Amino acid sequence: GFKELIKRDLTTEVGNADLSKLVENQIVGHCYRGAFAAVEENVQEIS
Amino acid sequence: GFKELIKRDLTTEVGNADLSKLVENQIVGHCYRGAFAAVEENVQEIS
Numbered sequence: 471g472f473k474e475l476i477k478r479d480l481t482t483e484v485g486n487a488d489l490s491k492l493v494e495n496q497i498v499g500h501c502y503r504g505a506f507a508a509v510e511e512n513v514q515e516i517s
Numbered sequence: 518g519f520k521e522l523i524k525r526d527l528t529t530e531v532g533n534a535d536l537s538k539l540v541e542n543q544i545v546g547h548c549y550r551g552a553f554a555a556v557e558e559n560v561q562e563i564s
Contacts, residue, residue, distance in 0.1 A: 489532035489545045 471511035477502035518558040524549035 484495040531542035 487532055489530065489543050492545075492547060 471508050473506040475504040475506070477504075479503075518553075518555035520553045522551035522553070524551075 478501060480499050480501045482497065482499040484497045487493060487495040525548050527546055527548045529544065529546040531544050534540055534542040
């Protein structure tokens with residue numbers, strides 16, 4: 471009843487370095503992922 | 518008493534360019550430098 475969808479893992483780019491301010495490249499990581507889960511497989515407990 | 522401090526001599530680099538206006542790469546040079554001075558070395562003179 472649980473399924474993970476992994477289109478793309480962590481992928482990191484570097485760019486948009488504004489030389490007019492001496493700022494370094496913006497470093498950005500991005501990921502394409504999804505999860506499928508349901509209450510039809512679980513029982514929650516106390517203590 | 519005078520000492521010259523060098524960290525980056527002269528670093529020239531080309532970066533962001535606005536393709537939407539057909540602008541070439543902005544060219545920017547930058548250097549990291551420092552100087553140390555004193556009064557224990559100099560005598561001012563007139564004429």
